[PDB]
């Protein structure tokens, strides 16, 4: 069934599961043509496939050559996402394959279900949550590797850096969603919060600054404040 | 013109014969139906006055034997029986016609409705869907489940319709996932028509039989099958032109005959709007689209 706030701790049990977000797969700029009409120009995208228990991110980079000569790209993008997720699952040893794949957008269900017919024991589930994974492309190192790609490419990251050495998966996922929600709602302010102090460094093999436990408390409070301020602005409340 | 004679009518019942129906009172002098047109299958069906639940009936072809109807007070239903003896049957029917104790199959000469609804339906294919080999006629009722329904419980009482499943390996070639899902022509033409049904007349015969079981018995699994077989054609970009014209005719007469007060449960809103307005064949069903728009614009 669908994933929501009632069954949210299920993400951190010992059944291997992956989130798949396809928001950033097909990305275009919209521009005017010489004749004054409108055209799209694609830029590189990515599939965001995340194990929320371990932090492992399988970032499949979608190079613009994928779209060359193809029609109905928004629809093709969902099928390309499903093809690549299935290819990932097939590449994993059986004991590493997920028991569930949770898609962030319901339109991914039929494409994935069809591509996963060979895996009847992998459940494909939607979610009622409004998860902020679209903001993955506001993480500088992720955006950089996507844009610099000259061909299709899979890049692996731990989206939690080393946090799991000190906190649980539940807490790490809450910290990630907070950071991503903030980046989604006001990227500039969110990045200012994270990036205001250049003497707080990011380790070459990390995505986020090396905050001490107490600095994380400060940062998390600042992100909460940002998100609530934006909320009142949106709804004049 | 053949006869389905009744031994009696001990319980009050509404009797259907194809698209017609008559009320018979408890113990009324009722000895069956005459003048049944030869050359088509037929269905004789029953709704007891005291259980508006369970409609049931018998598919038959008078060319295949001498069928009568006798009430069974143990099982509580009107049963079809074949009279081996052509002359016990003949002298009996002879009597009953003489006493004018038979209703006449009330076909209007100008009226092709029953032919139009049963054009591709053959008894031998019915008997493969409804497996009961010791009889030449086939029993169906409101509650019988389909083989497909049973995969998702008594196998002997099942409707063995051909299983159609759009999210199945049968429907989807490896490496053509998107192609075969969004354009079902492979599934229609190669898997189903060439492979399982052999020809389009057999396909249309099962589609027509499924509709009639849905309409006459409220058989839900039959309605599912009728819609699935329509959707498979409409969701195929490549369909023989002869099948498209025939489908339009087939659906037109089904929609024409459907009881207006049943369209809410017999017609699937999603299938019909997809088929008429979104699918590859949205412009190939002109007669069906016109009768649907003038009769059931609410559903669309
Ligand atoms: C046993 N019976 C038959 O032999 C028969 C044939 C026609 C009408 C009615 C009947 C009758 O009840």
Short mmCIF file of C-alpha atoms and ligand atoms in Angstrom, two decimals:
data_model
loop_
_atom_site.label_atom_id
_atom_site.label_comp_id
_atom_site.label_asym_id
_atom_site.label_seq_id
_atom_site.Cartn_x
_atom_site.Cartn_y
_atom_site.Cartn_z
CA UNK A 1 0.00 0.00 0.00
CA UNK A 2 0.89 3.68 -0.07
CA UNK A 3 3.62 5.05 2.19
CA UNK A 4 2.61 7.84 4.59
CA UNK A 5 3.21 9.27 8.06
CA UNK A 6 1.45 6.36 9.77
CA UNK A 7 3.96 3.78 8.48
CA UNK A 8 6.99 6.09 8.35
CA UNK A 9 9.28 4.12 10.66
CA UNK A 10 9.00 1.23 8.17
CA UNK A 11 11.72 3.04 6.17
CA UNK A 12 14.27 2.21 8.84
CA UNK A 13 13.54 -1.49 9.38
CA UNK A 14 15.79 -4.18 7.93
CA UNK A 15 13.85 -4.83 4.69
CA UNK A 16 16.03 -3.32 1.95
CA UNK A 17 14.09 -0.54 0.24
CA UNK A 18 14.79 2.18 -2.31
CA UNK A 19 13.12 5.48 -2.94
CA UNK A 20 13.07 6.50 -6.61
CA UNK A 21 12.55 10.13 -7.55
CA UNK A 22 12.29 11.02 -11.26
CA UNK A 23 11.69 14.78 -10.90
CA UNK A 24 15.16 15.69 -12.24
CA UNK A 25 15.35 13.15 -15.08
CA UNK A 26 14.01 15.33 -17.91
CA UNK A 27 15.12 18.94 -17.40
CA UNK A 28 14.61 21.75 -19.90
CA UNK A 29 15.14 25.44 -20.26
CA UNK A 30 12.36 27.20 -22.21
CA UNK A 31 13.42 29.89 -24.67
CA UNK A 32 12.25 31.88 -27.67
CA UNK A 33 13.30 31.00 -31.20
CA UNK A 34 14.49 33.31 -33.94
CA UNK A 35 10.93 33.39 -35.34
CA UNK A 36 9.58 34.28 -31.90
CA UNK A 37 8.14 30.84 -31.10
CA UNK A 38 9.00 28.82 -28.00
CA UNK A 39 11.43 25.91 -27.83
CA UNK A 40 12.89 23.71 -25.13
CA UNK A 41 16.54 22.90 -24.60
CA UNK A 42 17.33 19.85 -22.49
CA UNK A 43 20.13 19.77 -19.91
CA UNK A 44 21.60 16.74 -18.17
CA UNK A 45 19.37 15.11 -15.52
CA UNK A 46 19.57 12.29 -13.01
CA UNK A 47 17.56 9.56 -11.35
CA UNK A 48 17.66 9.87 -7.54
CA UNK A 49 17.59 6.33 -6.10
CA UNK A 50 18.16 6.31 -2.37
CA UNK A 51 18.37 3.67 0.35
CA UNK A 52 17.02 5.61 3.37
CA UNK A 53 18.39 3.07 5.87
CA UNK A 54 22.05 3.28 4.75
CA UNK A 55 22.26 6.59 2.92
CA UNK A 56 23.47 4.91 -0.27
CA UNK A 57 22.55 7.04 -3.29
CA UNK A 58 22.69 5.57 -6.81
CA UNK A 59 22.77 8.74 -8.91
CA UNK A 60 22.19 7.69 -12.53
CA UNK A 61 23.12 10.63 -14.74
CA UNK A 62 20.78 11.13 -17.72
CA UNK A 63 22.77 12.69 -20.54
CA UNK A 64 20.89 14.85 -23.01
CA UNK A 65 21.80 12.47 -25.83
CA UNK A 66 19.12 10.15 -24.42
CA UNK A 67 16.45 12.47 -25.78
CA UNK A 68 17.86 12.97 -29.25
CA UNK A 69 15.18 12.39 -31.89
CA UNK A 70 12.59 11.20 -29.40
CA UNK A 71 9.01 12.42 -29.04
CA UNK A 72 6.84 12.84 -25.94
CA UNK A 73 9.89 13.21 -23.72
CA UNK A 74 8.05 13.73 -20.41
CA UNK A 75 6.46 10.32 -20.95
CA UNK A 76 9.65 8.70 -22.23
CA UNK A 77 11.46 10.00 -19.14
CA UNK A 78 9.28 7.84 -16.88
CA UNK A 79 10.06 4.74 -18.92
CA UNK A 80 13.78 5.55 -19.05
CA UNK A 81 13.71 5.93 -15.26
CA UNK A 82 12.02 2.50 -14.98
CA UNK A 83 14.49 0.92 -17.40
CA UNK A 84 17.48 2.22 -15.43
CA UNK A 85 16.05 1.29 -11.99
CA UNK A 86 15.36 -2.23 -13.27
CA UNK A 87 18.87 -2.42 -14.75
CA UNK A 88 20.26 -1.37 -11.35
CA UNK A 89 18.29 -4.05 -9.54
CA UNK A 90 19.40 -6.70 -12.06
CA UNK A 91 23.04 -5.68 -11.53
CA UNK A 92 22.82 -6.22 -7.78
CA UNK A 93 23.42 -9.59 -6.13
CA UNK A 94 20.16 -11.16 -5.08
CA UNK A 95 20.80 -10.53 -1.38
CA UNK A 96 21.26 -6.82 -2.14
CA UNK A 97 18.11 -6.39 -4.24
CA UNK A 98 15.35 -4.28 -2.64
CA UNK A 99 12.18 -5.87 -1.34
CA UNK A 100 10.28 -2.61 -2.01
CA UNK A 101 10.74 0.36 -4.36
CA UNK A 102 8.81 3.47 -3.28
CA UNK A 103 8.25 5.95 -6.07
CA UNK A 104 7.82 9.60 -5.22
CA UNK A 105 5.38 10.22 -8.09
CA UNK A 106 2.42 7.96 -8.85
CA UNK A 107 2.99 8.21 -12.58
CA UNK A 108 6.12 6.09 -12.12
CA UNK A 109 4.08 3.07 -10.95
CA UNK A 110 3.01 1.52 -14.27
CA UNK A 111 6.42 2.03 -16.00
CA UNK A 112 8.27 0.52 -13.08
CA UNK A 113 5.79 -2.32 -12.58
CA UNK A 114 6.14 -3.25 -16.26
CA UNK A 115 9.94 -3.09 -16.22
CA UNK A 116 9.99 -5.13 -13.01
CA UNK A 117 7.80 -8.03 -14.19
CA UNK A 118 10.85 -10.31 -13.83
CA UNK A 119 10.92 -9.46 -10.09
CA UNK A 120 7.50 -10.44 -8.77
CA UNK A 121 8.78 -10.41 -5.16
CA UNK A 122 9.73 -6.69 -5.29
CA UNK A 123 6.80 -4.51 -4.28
CA UNK A 124 6.28 -1.21 -6.06
CA UNK A 125 4.64 1.38 -3.82
CA UNK A 126 3.57 5.02 -4.07
CA UNK A 127 3.68 7.48 -1.23
CA UNK A 128 1.39 10.16 0.14
CA UNK A 129 4.43 12.07 1.42
CA UNK A 130 5.48 15.26 -0.35
CA UNK A 131 9.15 14.37 -0.16
CA UNK A 132 11.59 17.09 -1.20
CA UNK A 133 13.98 14.99 -3.30
CA UNK A 134 13.55 17.37 -6.25
CA UNK A 135 15.99 19.61 -4.38
CA UNK A 136 18.84 17.09 -4.86
CA UNK A 137 20.10 19.32 -7.66
CA UNK A 138 20.62 22.09 -5.08
CA UNK A 139 23.38 20.01 -3.48
CA UNK A 140 26.46 21.52 -5.16
CA UNK A 141 28.48 18.33 -5.65
CA UNK A 142 25.48 16.49 -7.13
CA UNK A 143 24.58 19.33 -9.49
CA UNK A 144 28.23 19.60 -10.57
CA UNK A 145 28.67 15.94 -11.52
CA UNK A 146 25.36 15.92 -13.44
CA UNK A 147 26.19 19.03 -15.43
CA UNK A 148 29.78 17.95 -16.23
CA UNK A 149 28.80 14.49 -17.52
CA UNK A 150 29.55 13.95 -21.21
CA UNK A 151 27.96 10.49 -21.37
CA UNK A 152 25.63 8.30 -19.29
CA UNK A 153 27.18 7.56 -15.92
CA UNK A 154 26.28 6.11 -12.51
CA UNK A 155 27.84 7.84 -9.50
CA UNK A 156 27.55 6.58 -5.94
CA UNK A 157 27.30 8.73 -2.86
CA UNK A 158 26.31 8.44 0.77
CA UNK A 159 23.81 11.27 1.17
CA UNK A 160 24.28 11.11 4.96
CA UNK A 161 28.09 11.62 4.90
CA UNK A 162 29.28 10.03 8.19
CA UNK A 163 26.20 10.97 10.22
CA UNK A 164 25.28 7.35 10.85
CA UNK A 165 28.44 7.00 12.97
CA UNK A 166 26.63 9.16 15.56
CA UNK A 167 22.86 9.12 14.86
CA UNK A 168 20.23 6.62 13.74
CA UNK A 169 18.81 6.27 10.23
CA UNK A 170 15.53 7.77 11.41
CA UNK A 171 17.32 10.88 12.62
CA UNK A 172 19.58 11.11 9.58
CA UNK A 173 16.60 10.88 7.21
CA UNK A 174 14.83 13.59 9.20
CA UNK A 175 17.91 15.81 8.94
CA UNK A 176 18.15 15.15 5.19
CA UNK A 177 14.50 15.92 4.55
CA UNK A 178 14.80 19.10 6.59
CA UNK A 179 17.79 20.30 4.57
CA UNK A 180 16.15 19.36 1.31
CA UNK A 181 12.79 20.92 2.24
CA UNK A 182 14.66 24.14 3.08
CA UNK A 183 16.61 24.12 -0.20
CA UNK A 184 13.34 23.56 -2.07
CA UNK A 185 11.45 26.40 -0.39
CA UNK A 186 14.20 29.03 -0.54
CA UNK A 187 17.44 27.79 -2.07
CA UNK A 188 19.37 31.02 -1.54
CA UNK A 189 18.60 31.37 2.15
CA UNK A 190 19.10 27.64 2.72
CA UNK A 191 22.54 27.70 1.11
CA UNK A 192 23.43 30.83 3.08
CA UNK A 193 22.65 28.92 6.29
CA UNK A 194 24.87 26.01 5.29
CA UNK A 195 27.57 28.12 3.57
CA UNK A 196 27.79 31.43 5.67
CA UNK A 197 31.07 30.21 7.36
CA UNK A 198 33.79 29.12 4.86
CA UNK A 199 36.10 27.94 7.74
CA UNK A 200 33.57 25.06 8.41
CA UNK A 201 34.77 22.60 5.76
CA UNK A 202 33.24 19.82 3.66
CA UNK A 203 35.42 16.69 3.43
CA UNK A 204 36.37 15.75 -0.13
CA UNK A 205 34.24 12.60 0.26
CA UNK A 206 31.19 14.38 1.77
CA UNK A 207 28.29 16.44 0.50
CA UNK A 208 27.52 18.55 3.57
CA UNK A 209 29.67 20.67 5.92
CA UNK A 210 31.43 19.02 8.84
CA UNK A 211 29.17 20.41 11.54
CA UNK A 212 29.76 19.42 15.12
CA UNK A 213 26.74 17.96 16.90
CA UNK A 214 25.98 21.34 18.46
CA UNK A 215 26.34 23.21 15.17
CA UNK A 216 23.88 20.75 13.62
CA UNK A 217 21.36 21.70 16.27
CA UNK A 218 21.86 25.34 15.33
CA UNK A 219 21.63 24.63 11.60
CA UNK A 220 18.52 22.50 11.99
CA UNK A 221 16.84 25.26 14.00
CA UNK A 222 17.74 27.78 11.29
CA UNK A 223 16.30 25.52 8.58
CA UNK A 224 13.09 25.04 10.57
CA UNK A 225 12.75 28.82 10.89
CA UNK A 226 13.33 29.30 7.16
CA UNK A 227 10.68 26.77 6.23
CA UNK A 228 8.06 28.27 8.54
CA UNK A 229 8.76 31.82 7.39
CA UNK A 230 8.28 30.79 3.77
CA UNK A 231 5.10 28.99 4.79
CA UNK A 232 3.55 32.14 6.25
CA UNK A 233 4.60 34.13 3.20
CA UNK A 234 2.96 31.66 0.81
CA UNK A 235 -0.39 31.62 2.63
CA UNK A 236 -0.42 35.10 4.21
CA UNK A 237 -0.81 33.48 7.64
CA UNK B 1 -38.47 -23.11 -35.95
CA UNK B 2 -37.83 -25.14 -32.78
CA UNK B 3 -39.40 -25.45 -29.37
CA UNK B 4 -38.06 -25.44 -25.70
CA UNK B 5 -41.04 -27.11 -23.98
CA UNK B 6 -41.58 -26.94 -20.20
CA UNK B 7 -43.04 -29.80 -18.22
CA UNK B 8 -44.74 -27.28 -15.89
CA UNK B 9 -44.22 -24.02 -13.99
CA UNK B 10 -44.53 -24.82 -10.27
CA UNK B 11 -43.01 -21.57 -9.00
CA UNK B 12 -43.64 -17.98 -10.02
CA UNK B 13 -40.82 -16.83 -12.26
CA UNK B 14 -39.80 -14.29 -14.87
CA UNK B 15 -38.56 -16.21 -17.90
CA UNK B 16 -36.21 -14.68 -20.43
CA UNK B 17 -35.65 -15.97 -23.93
CA UNK B 18 -32.88 -14.00 -25.61
CA UNK B 19 -33.81 -10.29 -25.24
CA UNK B 20 -37.50 -11.03 -24.40
CA UNK B 21 -39.12 -11.80 -21.02
CA UNK B 22 -42.48 -13.07 -19.78
CA UNK B 23 -43.91 -13.46 -16.27
CA UNK B 24 -45.32 -16.86 -15.32
CA UNK B 25 -47.44 -17.28 -12.20
CA UNK B 26 -47.12 -20.12 -9.67
CA UNK B 27 -48.67 -23.26 -11.18
CA UNK B 28 -49.87 -21.31 -14.19
CA UNK B 29 -50.80 -23.89 -17.46
CA UNK B 30 -47.40 -22.93 -19.00
CA UNK B 31 -45.67 -25.35 -21.34
CA UNK B 32 -42.76 -23.34 -22.79
CA UNK B 33 -41.67 -21.47 -25.90
CA UNK B 34 -42.22 -22.19 -29.65
CA UNK B 35 -41.18 -20.69 -32.96
CA UNK B 36 -37.56 -20.23 -31.82
CA UNK B 37 -35.55 -19.16 -34.88
CA UNK B 38 -33.15 -21.76 -36.13
CA UNK B 39 -29.60 -20.81 -36.90
CA UNK B 40 -28.56 -18.91 -33.81
CA UNK B 41 -27.59 -19.84 -30.31
CA UNK B 42 -30.18 -18.86 -27.75
CA UNK B 43 -30.40 -18.34 -24.00
CA UNK B 44 -33.36 -19.15 -21.76
CA UNK B 45 -33.04 -17.58 -18.31
CA UNK B 46 -34.88 -17.31 -15.05
CA UNK B 47 -35.53 -14.97 -12.16
CA UNK B 48 -37.66 -16.39 -9.39
CA UNK B 49 -40.28 -14.05 -7.97
CA UNK B 50 -39.09 -14.77 -4.44
CA UNK B 51 -35.30 -14.41 -4.93
CA UNK B 52 -34.46 -11.46 -7.16
CA UNK B 53 -30.89 -12.61 -6.47
CA UNK B 54 -29.38 -15.32 -8.66
CA UNK B 55 -30.46 -14.96 -12.25
CA UNK B 56 -29.51 -18.17 -14.07
CA UNK B 57 -30.04 -19.72 -17.47
CA UNK B 58 -28.99 -22.04 -20.27
CA UNK B 59 -27.21 -21.37 -23.55
CA UNK B 60 -28.36 -23.75 -26.29
CA UNK B 61 -28.74 -24.37 -30.04
CA UNK B 62 -31.84 -26.25 -31.12
CA UNK B 63 -29.84 -27.82 -33.95
CA UNK B 64 -27.91 -29.82 -31.31
CA UNK B 65 -30.79 -31.73 -29.72
CA UNK B 66 -34.27 -31.86 -28.14
CA UNK B 67 -34.05 -29.74 -24.94
CA UNK B 68 -36.97 -29.32 -22.44
CA UNK B 69 -37.19 -27.53 -19.01
CA UNK B 70 -38.41 -29.29 -15.79
CA UNK B 71 -38.52 -27.72 -12.29
CA UNK B 72 -36.45 -29.53 -9.67
CA UNK B 73 -37.98 -29.01 -6.18
CA UNK B 74 -34.84 -30.37 -4.50
CA UNK B 75 -32.32 -27.99 -6.06
CA UNK B 76 -34.96 -25.30 -6.44
CA UNK B 77 -34.44 -24.46 -10.07
CA UNK B 78 -35.74 -24.84 -13.55
CA UNK B 79 -33.38 -27.32 -15.22
CA UNK B 80 -32.67 -27.88 -18.91
CA UNK B 81 -32.75 -31.62 -19.95
CA UNK B 82 -32.21 -33.16 -23.44
CA UNK B 83 -34.96 -35.51 -24.67
CA UNK B 84 -33.01 -38.39 -26.42
CA UNK B 85 -36.35 -39.85 -27.65
CA UNK B 86 -37.29 -37.64 -30.64
CA UNK B 87 -40.92 -39.05 -30.58
CA UNK B 88 -41.66 -38.86 -26.79
CA UNK B 89 -40.56 -35.17 -27.35
CA UNK B 90 -42.51 -34.79 -30.65
CA UNK B 91 -45.99 -36.19 -29.42
CA UNK B 92 -45.63 -34.08 -26.20
CA UNK B 93 -44.79 -30.82 -28.07
CA UNK B 94 -47.56 -31.69 -30.59
CA UNK B 95 -50.11 -31.89 -27.72
CA UNK B 96 -48.89 -28.59 -26.03
CA UNK B 97 -49.03 -26.67 -29.39
CA UNK B 98 -52.57 -28.05 -29.86
CA UNK B 99 -53.65 -26.83 -26.41
CA UNK B 100 -51.96 -23.49 -27.19
CA UNK B 101 -49.92 -23.74 -23.97
CA UNK B 102 -46.69 -22.27 -25.45
CA UNK B 103 -45.71 -18.64 -25.93
CA UNK B 104 -44.37 -17.67 -29.35
CA UNK B 105 -40.83 -16.35 -29.69
CA UNK B 106 -41.90 -12.82 -30.46
CA UNK B 107 -39.51 -11.84 -33.21
CA UNK B 108 -40.44 -8.82 -35.31
CA UNK B 109 -39.63 -9.61 -38.93
CA UNK B 110 -37.71 -6.32 -39.43
CA UNK B 111 -35.66 -6.97 -36.26
CA UNK B 112 -32.07 -8.21 -36.49
CA UNK B 113 -31.18 -7.51 -32.85
CA UNK B 114 -30.49 -11.08 -31.79
CA UNK B 115 -28.43 -11.91 -34.85
CA UNK B 116 -26.45 -8.69 -34.32
CA UNK B 117 -25.70 -9.60 -30.70
CA UNK B 118 -24.75 -13.26 -31.42
CA UNK B 119 -23.20 -13.01 -34.91
CA UNK B 120 -19.86 -14.59 -33.87
CA UNK B 121 -21.09 -16.67 -30.93
CA UNK B 122 -20.94 -20.44 -31.53
CA UNK B 123 -22.14 -23.18 -29.17
CA UNK B 124 -18.88 -25.11 -29.39
CA UNK B 125 -16.94 -22.12 -28.08
CA UNK B 126 -19.47 -21.55 -25.29
CA UNK B 127 -18.93 -25.16 -24.17
CA UNK B 128 -15.18 -24.53 -23.95
CA UNK B 129 -15.75 -21.45 -21.75
CA UNK B 130 -18.46 -23.24 -19.74
CA UNK B 131 -17.07 -26.74 -19.22
CA UNK B 132 -19.80 -29.35 -18.68
CA UNK B 133 -19.26 -31.94 -21.37
CA UNK B 134 -22.15 -34.27 -20.50
CA UNK B 135 -24.63 -31.62 -21.65
CA UNK B 136 -25.06 -29.99 -25.06
CA UNK B 137 -26.29 -26.78 -23.35
CA UNK B 138 -24.41 -24.54 -20.92
CA UNK B 139 -25.55 -23.22 -17.53
CA UNK B 140 -24.54 -19.68 -16.39
CA UNK B 141 -25.61 -17.64 -13.36
CA UNK B 142 -25.01 -14.32 -11.65
CA UNK B 143 -22.46 -15.69 -9.18
CA UNK B 144 -20.14 -17.74 -11.37
CA UNK B 145 -16.53 -16.53 -11.23
CA UNK B 146 -14.00 -16.40 -14.05
CA UNK B 147 -10.69 -18.24 -14.24
CA UNK B 148 -8.94 -14.87 -14.05
CA UNK B 149 -11.03 -13.90 -11.02
CA UNK B 150 -10.02 -17.21 -9.38
CA UNK B 151 -6.28 -16.58 -9.80
CA UNK B 152 -6.57 -13.38 -7.73
CA UNK B 153 -12.73 -21.17 -5.92
CA UNK B 154 -14.48 -24.25 -7.37
CA UNK B 155 -12.86 -24.91 -10.78
CA UNK B 156 -15.85 -26.85 -12.18
CA UNK B 157 -18.24 -23.87 -11.93
CA UNK B 158 -15.95 -21.32 -13.60
CA UNK B 159 -16.16 -19.23 -16.75
CA UNK B 160 -13.00 -20.15 -18.67
CA UNK B 161 -12.60 -16.86 -20.50
CA UNK B 162 -9.22 -16.16 -22.09
CA UNK B 163 -7.11 -14.32 -19.51
CA UNK B 164 -6.15 -10.78 -20.59
CA UNK B 165 -3.67 -8.97 -18.36
CA UNK B 166 -1.94 -5.84 -19.63
CA UNK B 167 0.82 -5.92 -16.97
CA UNK B 168 1.94 -9.46 -17.64
CA UNK B 169 4.88 -11.07 -19.36
CA UNK B 170 2.45 -12.50 -21.92
CA UNK B 171 1.51 -8.92 -22.81
CA UNK B 172 5.01 -7.39 -22.80
CA UNK B 173 8.05 -8.45 -24.81
CA UNK B 174 11.38 -8.14 -22.96
CA UNK B 175 13.06 -5.04 -24.33
CA UNK B 176 9.76 -3.64 -25.66
CA UNK B 177 8.30 -2.65 -22.27
CA UNK B 178 7.20 0.87 -23.10
CA UNK B 179 6.39 0.05 -26.72
CA UNK B 180 4.18 -2.95 -25.95
CA UNK B 181 2.49 -1.33 -22.97
CA UNK B 182 1.51 1.85 -24.81
CA UNK B 183 0.71 0.09 -28.13
CA UNK B 184 -0.85 -3.30 -27.49
CA UNK B 185 -0.86 -4.39 -31.14
CA UNK B 186 1.71 -7.14 -30.48
CA UNK B 187 -0.48 -8.58 -27.73
CA UNK B 188 -3.68 -8.30 -29.79
CA UNK B 189 -2.44 -9.57 -33.14
CA UNK B 190 0.32 -12.06 -32.34
CA UNK B 191 -0.41 -13.41 -28.84
CA UNK B 192 -4.21 -13.32 -28.86
CA UNK B 193 -5.49 -13.37 -32.44
CA UNK B 194 -2.83 -15.49 -34.17
CA UNK B 195 -1.83 -17.50 -31.12
CA UNK B 196 -4.83 -18.23 -28.89
CA UNK B 197 -8.04 -17.24 -30.68
CA UNK B 198 -6.74 -18.17 -34.18
CA UNK B 199 -9.03 -15.61 -35.89
CA UNK B 200 -11.03 -12.49 -35.14
CA UNK B 201 -14.43 -14.23 -35.35
CA UNK B 202 -13.52 -16.36 -32.30
CA UNK B 203 -12.33 -13.20 -30.48
CA UNK B 204 -15.57 -11.40 -31.26
CA UNK B 205 -17.58 -14.49 -30.26
CA UNK B 206 -16.07 -14.51 -26.77
CA UNK B 207 -16.50 -10.73 -26.47
CA UNK B 208 -20.16 -11.04 -27.46
CA UNK B 209 -20.76 -13.99 -25.07
CA UNK B 210 -19.14 -12.09 -22.18
CA UNK B 211 -21.38 -9.09 -22.79
CA UNK B 212 -24.54 -11.22 -22.90
CA UNK B 213 -23.66 -12.95 -19.62
CA UNK B 214 -23.03 -9.55 -18.04
CA UNK B 215 -26.36 -8.21 -19.30
CA UNK B 216 -28.61 -11.19 -18.65
CA UNK B 217 -27.12 -12.44 -15.37
CA UNK B 218 -25.29 -9.43 -13.96
CA UNK B 219 -22.17 -11.60 -14.08
CA UNK B 220 -19.39 -9.30 -12.95
CA UNK B 221 -16.46 -11.33 -14.25
CA UNK B 222 -18.12 -11.37 -17.67
CA UNK B 223 -18.41 -7.59 -17.64
CA UNK B 224 -14.71 -7.38 -16.76
CA UNK B 225 -13.87 -9.63 -19.70
CA UNK B 226 -16.03 -7.68 -22.19
CA UNK B 227 -14.34 -4.42 -21.23
CA UNK B 228 -10.86 -5.98 -21.33
CA UNK B 229 -11.42 -7.31 -24.85
CA UNK B 230 -12.68 -3.90 -26.03
CA UNK B 231 -9.78 -2.09 -24.40
CA UNK B 232 -7.21 -4.40 -25.98
CA UNK B 233 -8.42 -3.55 -29.49
CA UNK B 234 -8.77 0.16 -28.81
CA UNK B 235 -5.29 0.39 -27.22
CA UNK B 236 -3.72 -1.18 -30.34
CA UNK B 237 -2.48 1.19 -33.05
CA UNK B 238 -2.48 -1.57 -35.69
CA UNK B 239 -5.81 -3.39 -36.09
CA UNK B 240 -7.17 -4.91 -39.32
CA UNK B 241 -9.65 -2.46 -40.79
CA UNK B 242 -12.24 -5.24 -41.03
CA UNK B 243 -12.08 -5.82 -37.27
CA UNK B 244 -12.55 -2.13 -36.52
CA UNK B 245 -15.68 -1.84 -38.64
CA UNK B 246 -17.08 -5.03 -37.19
CA UNK B 247 -16.28 -3.95 -33.60
CA UNK B 248 -18.18 -0.69 -34.11
CA UNK B 249 -21.20 -2.69 -35.25
CA UNK B 250 -20.84 -5.14 -32.38
CA UNK B 251 -20.63 -2.47 -29.69
CA UNK B 252 -23.39 -0.38 -31.26
CA UNK B 253 -25.95 -3.16 -30.91
CA UNK B 254 -24.77 -4.02 -27.38
CA UNK B 255 -25.15 -0.41 -26.23
CA UNK B 256 -28.50 -0.17 -28.02
CA UNK B 257 -29.90 -3.23 -26.25
CA UNK B 258 -28.52 -2.57 -22.75
CA UNK B 259 -31.21 -1.65 -20.21
CA UNK B 260 -30.95 2.06 -19.48
CA UNK B 261 -31.24 1.54 -15.72
CA UNK B 262 -28.19 -0.81 -15.79
CA UNK B 263 -25.70 1.46 -17.56
CA UNK B 264 -24.35 2.59 -14.17
CA UNK B 265 -23.04 -0.88 -13.28
CA UNK B 266 -22.61 -2.43 -16.75
CA UNK B 267 -20.46 0.35 -18.26
CA UNK B 268 -16.97 1.15 -16.99
CA UNK B 269 -16.48 4.92 -17.19
CA UNK B 270 -12.70 4.72 -17.58
CA UNK B 271 -12.64 2.13 -20.35
CA UNK B 272 -15.33 3.83 -22.41
CA UNK B 273 -13.88 7.35 -22.17
CA UNK B 274 -10.39 6.03 -22.96
CA UNK B 275 -11.67 3.97 -25.86
CA UNK B 276 -13.86 6.68 -27.38
CA UNK B 277 -11.70 9.78 -26.78
CA UNK B 278 -8.05 8.90 -25.99
CA UNK B 279 -7.15 5.58 -27.60
CA UNK B 280 -5.66 4.84 -30.98
CA UNK B 281 -9.17 3.92 -32.17
CA UNK B 282 -10.97 7.01 -30.77
CA UNK B 283 -12.01 7.89 -34.34
CA UNK B 284 -12.81 4.36 -35.57
CA UNK B 285 -16.03 3.71 -33.63
CA UNK B 286 -18.39 6.25 -35.15
CA UNK B 287 -21.65 4.38 -34.65
CA UNK B 288 -20.76 3.33 -31.11
CA UNK B 289 -19.62 6.86 -30.21
CA UNK B 290 -22.87 8.31 -31.54
CA UNK B 291 -25.19 5.97 -29.67
CA UNK B 292 -23.11 6.34 -26.48
CA UNK B 293 -23.22 10.17 -26.65
CA UNK B 294 -27.01 10.29 -27.27
CA UNK B 295 -27.94 7.65 -24.67
CA UNK B 296 -25.31 7.82 -21.89
CA UNK B 297 -23.75 11.29 -22.04
CA UNK B 298 -23.73 11.19 -18.23
CA UNK B 299 -21.08 8.47 -18.05
CA UNK B 300 -18.80 10.33 -20.44
C1 LIG C 1 -39.50 -36.08 -19.14
N1 LIG C 1 -40.06 -35.20 -20.15
C2 LIG C 1 -39.82 -35.31 -21.33
O1 LIG C 1 -39.74 -36.38 -21.74
C3 LIG C 1 -40.30 -34.12 -22.01
C4 LIG C 1 -40.18 -33.72 -23.35
C5 LIG C 1 -40.78 -32.55 -23.73
C6 LIG C 1 -41.51 -31.82 -22.83
C7 LIG C 1 -41.65 -32.25 -21.51
C8 LIG C 1 -41.01 -33.40 -21.11
C9 LIG C 1 -41.10 -34.25 -19.88
O2 LIG C 1 -41.15 -33.93 -18.66
#
